[PDB]
Design a protein around this ligand. Sequence first.
Ligand SMILES: CC(C)=CCC/C(C)=C/CC/C(C)=C/CC/C=C(\C)CC/C=C(\C)CCCN(C)C
Ligand SMILES: CC(C)=CCC/C(C)=C/CC/C(C)=C/CC/C=C(\C)CC/C=C(\C)CCCN(C)C
Ligand SMILES: CCCCCCCCOCCOCCOCCOCCO
Ligand SMILES: CCCCCCCCOCCOCCOCCOCCO
Ligand SMILES: CCCCCCCCOCCOCCOCCOCCO
Lengths: 619, 619
Amino acid sequence: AYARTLDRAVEYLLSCQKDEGYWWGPLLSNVTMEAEYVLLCHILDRVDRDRMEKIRRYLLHEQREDGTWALYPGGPPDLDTTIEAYVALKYIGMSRDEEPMQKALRFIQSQGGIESSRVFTRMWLALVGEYPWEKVPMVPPEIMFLGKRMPLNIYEFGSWARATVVALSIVMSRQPVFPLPERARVPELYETDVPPRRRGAKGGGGWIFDALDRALHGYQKLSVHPFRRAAEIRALDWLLERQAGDGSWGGIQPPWFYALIALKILDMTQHPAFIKGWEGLELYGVELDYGGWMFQASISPVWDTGLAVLALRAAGLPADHDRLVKAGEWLLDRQITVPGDWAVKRPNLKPGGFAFQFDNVYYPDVDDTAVVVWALNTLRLPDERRRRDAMTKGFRWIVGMQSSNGGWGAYDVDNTSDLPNHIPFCDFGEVTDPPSEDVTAHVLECFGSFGYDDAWKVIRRAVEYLKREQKPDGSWFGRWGVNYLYGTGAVVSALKAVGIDTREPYIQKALDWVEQHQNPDGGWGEDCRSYEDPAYAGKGASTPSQTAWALMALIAGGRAESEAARRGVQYLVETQRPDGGWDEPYYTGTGFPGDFYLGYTMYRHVFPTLALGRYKQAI
Amino acid sequence: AYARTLDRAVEYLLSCQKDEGYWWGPLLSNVTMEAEYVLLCHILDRVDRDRMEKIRRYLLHEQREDGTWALYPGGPPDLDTTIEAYVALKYIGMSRDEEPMQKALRFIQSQGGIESSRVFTRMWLALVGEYPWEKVPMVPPEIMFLGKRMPLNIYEFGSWARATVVALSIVMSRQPVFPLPERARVPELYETDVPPRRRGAKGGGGWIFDALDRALHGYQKLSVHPFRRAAEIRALDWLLERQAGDGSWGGIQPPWFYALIALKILDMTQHPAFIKGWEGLELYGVELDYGGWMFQASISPVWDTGLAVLALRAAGLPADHDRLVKAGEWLLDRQITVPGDWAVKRPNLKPGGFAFQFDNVYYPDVDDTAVVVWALNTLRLPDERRRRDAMTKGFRWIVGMQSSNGGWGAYDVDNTSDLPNHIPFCDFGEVTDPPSEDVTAHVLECFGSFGYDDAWKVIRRAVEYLKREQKPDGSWFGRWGVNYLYGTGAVVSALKAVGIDTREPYIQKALDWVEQHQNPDGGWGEDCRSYEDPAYAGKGASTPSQTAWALMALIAGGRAESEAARRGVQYLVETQRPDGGWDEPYYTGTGFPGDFYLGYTMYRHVFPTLALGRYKQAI
Ligand SMILES: CC(C)=CCC/C(C)=C/CC/C(C)=C/CC/C=C(\C)CC/C=C(\C)CCCN(C)C
Ligand SMILES: CC(C)=CCC/C(C)=C/CC/C(C)=C/CC/C=C(\C)CC/C=C(\C)CCCN(C)C
Ligand SMILES: CCCCCCCCOCCOCCOCCOCCO
Ligand SMILES: CCCCCCCCOCCOCCOCCOCCO
Ligand SMILES: CCCCCCCCOCCOCCOCCOCCO
C-alpha cells in the first residue's frame, strides 16, 4: 500500500535538505510584499531596474484573468492587494490603458476605490503623496511614554504589531512624502460611484479612540510639540535595541520596511543599523524560474527543520542517522540564550526558546520551541551533554511561558487585552497574541515525548483549556494553519501523546468529525474561506498537508485499521508525484484569520511523510 | 638646486594614491593597541592562533635591546606599555624564563610594578582577573543621568574620552572578570621592593573626587542599586545611536574595544551592532612585511588626502589634474550633513564638517574640515556647484564652531571645563578638548585661501587668541603635531595667510626662534621629549616633516632667500631617496602631550613636497 510511497517521500525529503543540515522552503503570501518593496526602493532612492522588471513579471503572473489579486490561490478578489499591485505596476512602467491595468482598475472602482481600503494601503499611498496623511489614523511617538501597566502601552500589542507601531510612531510623527513621478500618480483610484465601504478596527468602532485620533491630528498642525523629540528618541532606541542579526525587525516584512523608512527620515542612512537592515533584505528575496522575483513575508527554516526531523523519525530513520545528526547539531546552535520582549511578563524566567527565522533572538515563539525540543528528544547526538542541556532549557522555558488560561500563545504570556482592536489604526489582522489551540497542542505533544502525562499539573490545565475551546460540532480551531482540520488534527494527536484515553466521548466526537469530513478522493481539504464561513469548515479541494493532519488524528485515536485511514493513505499513495513529493497549489498556512494567508511550501512533503510514518508504526 | 627633487616627490606622492582617489598611510602609535587587542580576543573568546603569533612577532620586534617598550621611537622606557606587552606575550605563549621577558620584568619591577601603572592598564588586568576591580577608579552608569549643565556630565569631556567613559560605565558597573589560563597569570608583576609611584589624576589632588570614588565603590558592594539598570540602558542607547558606519565608535581604538566588551557582558554578541563592531576591526589591522601585525589607533585617509592635494597643488600640479579631480570628487562624498555631538553646544548650526576616518559622521573635526575645505578651494572639478556648496557648508560650520576665547578646538565649542581632569579615572592623556593654536592656525589658513583677513571679527579674535598663547621665546605649542616647530610653522603660515604684516615684532621673534634651532645638518627636528622637558623645545634629530614645517614658517615670513631656508631646502634635496620619498624613523604626530604619540607615515612625503612647492612659488 504505502511502503514504496514512504521510501520515496523519505528520499525526496532528504534530497531537499541543505548541506548545513536544515530545511527551508519559501513562504508564499500575496503581492503587497513586492508592491511595498517597490515603493520602499522609491522612498530610499535605490531602484534597481532589473529587479523592478522581475517584479513586474511577478505581479502580472499573479494577476488572475479578472485583473485582480487575492490573499490566497483560488481566493476571492482582494481590494487592498489589487490597489497596491496596480500602483506598483504604474510606477515600474505599465500605462493605465493596458488591459491588465484597465481590468484591475474597474474592480478597484466597483469596491469603492481607495476610501474602502485598509489603513496600511492608504498609508503607503500617503508616503508617496497619493493620499492625505490627515486621513491616516495616527500612531503618535508619545505612545512610548505609556508605562507597563497602562492602557494601549506597546506591550499589550502582540509581537508583530508592537514593532510595527514603534517604527510607524516615528514615521507618522513626521508625515513624510516622497512624490511619485507625475506619470505614476493614480488619481483614477478615487474616481468611483460606490460610496466608501468602511471597515474599522477589528472588533468595532468605539468613539473614544475616534476622538483621540482627531485630537492627535489636531496636535500635528501645531508647531510646538513638547516632549515629542524625547518620545521619538525612545522609539528609535527601542528599534536600535531590537534589530535582529539578519538586519530585520522581527524577521517580518512590515516592521522591517517601516523601520528602514523611520531611519531614512531621521537621516540615518549612514548608521550601521540602516546599512545592515538594507543589505539584509536580499536573504528574503527569491528568484523565480519563470523570470519573476518575490519577497518573503517571513522565513521558516527552524520550523521546516524541526518538522523534517519529526517526519523522518516517524517514517523510520534512526535517532543517530547522520543527516538527522547534522540537523540536530544545527538546531542546537539556534537556541536563544537572552531575554526577549516575553521577559516583560516573565522577568525571572531563564531564556531557552527558539525562533522561526535564522537569527531573531528577541522573538522566540512557543511553537518552534515545542517542535524543536521534541525533535531533539528523538535524536542521538555526539554532543550528548549539550543536547540534554538544550532540551532542559527549552522544556523549562515553555513550562514558564504558559498563560493563566492553561494554554500557550506564540510569543507571550497573557497577551490578551481587548483594547488594541478598537483604535482606528488596527483594522487588519490580529494585534494581540492570546493562547491558541494549536501551539498548546504542540507543547503537549512535546511534553508527551518526554513521557509526561495528566498527573503533572501543567498538562492538566493545558487539557482543560482545550476542552473549553472545543467547538460544538466537535472540532478545534486552527490559529496558524488551515483550519479546523489543522487544529483538530494537532489537538487529538496531543491528547493521545499525553496519555489521555481517546475513547472518551469528546475525542470520539472529534475523530468522528474528521472521519465525516473525508473527501471522495480519500484525502481531506479545507479552504481559507473557512475562517469566514461555517459552511467551509473542513471543506475544500484535497491537499496533501491537510490529509496528513486528518490521517494523524485518526491514527492517534487508534483508527489506523479504519477504512477512513486506508482511503487517506491510498490518496497519498496515488497523488504522490513521480519524484516522491506532492503538489499543493492551495495555501494551508494562516498568518491572520481572514486577512493574511501563508503557503508553507514544505508542508506538502513533510506532513505526508510524518502521517505515513505514524501509519507504519501503528501497524 | 631643487627642481628634480620636487618632480620626483610629486611622482612618488602620485604613486601612493589609491585607485579610488584618496591617500591613506598607516597611523603608528605603541604596542598597547595590540596588547589590548590580544586581551580583547581572550575576553570575547575569539582567539585566532595565526594572528596571535603575528602579534608576538610584532611585540618582540618593537622591544628594545633593554627589554622595554616606548611611546615613540627612541623614547624612554614606558612602564604601562611594557606591562601590557609583557602580559600579552605571556598569554600568547612566552615563558617568564625567556630572555626578552626577563629584561622586561626587571624593568617593570624597578618602577614599582603594577601599582605604579595607569588606570587603563590596571583596568585591563582587572578584566582578566589579575588586579582587583575594587582598586580601579569607578565610572558609574549613573553619569548618564547628569544633564548638560551639571558637573561631570559626559558633554564636559572631550569626544574621545566621552565615548570611552560611556562604554566603561557599563563595564565597571558589572566588574566582569575573564580569567587568564593559569600559566599566563602574572603575580610576578607585583613582586618589588620599590614603592608605588602613584601619578594620579592629570590635573591634581581634588579630594572631593577621591571621596566620591570611595563612595561609588561602597555603593558597588550593596546588592540593590535603584535606577542603575535605567542608567545602563541610557549608556547602551547612547552607544547604539553613535556607532560609526565602519563598526567602530569614534574611529578610535579605546571606545571601540570598550563598547565591544560592554556589548559582550550584556549578552549582545548576536546583536548586529556587535557583529559589525567585531567584523569592522579588520579594516584597522595591518599585516607587516616581517610577519607581524598591528592595529591602528585611528585611520587618517581624509587628513592624508587633504594634505596630499594641498602639497601637489603647491608643487604645481594643475587644479584640474585628473588625479586631483578624482581626489576632490572623493572628498565631496565624505562631507557630513547630519548633527553630531557638537550640536549639543550648537543646536541650530547646519552640519558641514569632515571626519579624519572614512565613516565617522558624529565626530567631524575642525582640523580635517579646514584642511578639506581649503583643498577643495584649490581644485577645479566638473561638478562645480557641488564644490561651491561643499565649501560653503564647511566654511560656515567652522565659523559656528569658534570657541569664546577666539580659537578652535578639534571637536567641540568651549570644551574647557577644569573638572574632568581631577577625577582619579583621568590619569592619562587629555580628557577635554579646549581650543589649541594649531587647529586655529589651520582654520585661519583655510579662511585666508578665500581672501578673508582681519577686517573680519572672527579672524581678529583668532589672531588675538594666538598672540595671547605665544610663548616667551616666540614659539607656539603644537597640540596635535610635534611640537613648537609644528605650532610655530602652522601659526606663522596662518598669520601670513590672513594678511598680517610678518614684519611685526612678535612674528619676527618667532622667525628668529625657528632659525636659531636649525640643526647643523641643515634640517630641523624636535623629539617628543619636548612636551615634558624644556631642554628639548625645538630640538631633536632632523626629520623631513619637521624641516618642512620650519621651512614653511621661514617662507611665510619672507625669508625664502635666507641662508637658513637655503640650507633647509638643501637638506631635503640631499636626504630624498631615489624613489622620491623620504625616510622618517621618528614620530612627529601628537595624540596627547606627554602620553600618546603618533607616526603619520605620509608626513615624511607630503610635507617636504608642500614646503618645496611653497619654496618654488616664493623664488
Ligand atoms: C499591526 C499589524 C497587524 C502588523 C502586521 C502586518 C502584516 C502584513 C503582517 C504579515 C506577517 C505576519 C503573518 C506576521 C505575524 C507573525 C507571523 C509569522 C512570523 C509567520 C510565522 C508564524 C509564527 C512563528 C507563529 C507560530 C506559527 N507556527 C510556526 C505555525
Ligand atoms: C579618557 C581617554 C583619554 C581616552 C583615550 C585614550 C587613548 C589611549 C587614546 C588614543 C587615541 C587618541 C590619541 C585619541 C584622541 C583623538 C585622536 C585622533 C582621532 C587622531 C587624529 C586627531 C584628530 C582628528 C584631532 C585633530 C588633529 N589633526 C587631524 C592633526
Ligand atoms: C525599558 C526600556 C526597554 C528595555 C530594553 C532592554 C535593553 C537591553 O539590551 C538588550 C536588548 O534587548 C532588547 C529587548 O530585550 C527584551 C528585554 O526586555 C525589556 C523589557 O522592558
Ligand atoms: C525613568 C527613570 C528616571 C530616573 C532618574 C534617576 C535619578 C537621577 O540620579 C542621579 C544620580 O547622579 C549620580 C551621578 O554619578 C556620579 C558621576 O560620576 C562621574 C564619573 O566619576
Ligand atoms: C538622550 C538623547 C540625546 C539625543 C541623541 C540623538 C538621537 C538621534 O540619534 C541619531 C544619531 O545621533 C548621534 C548623536 O547625535 C548627536 C545629536 O545631538 C544630541 C545631543 O543630545
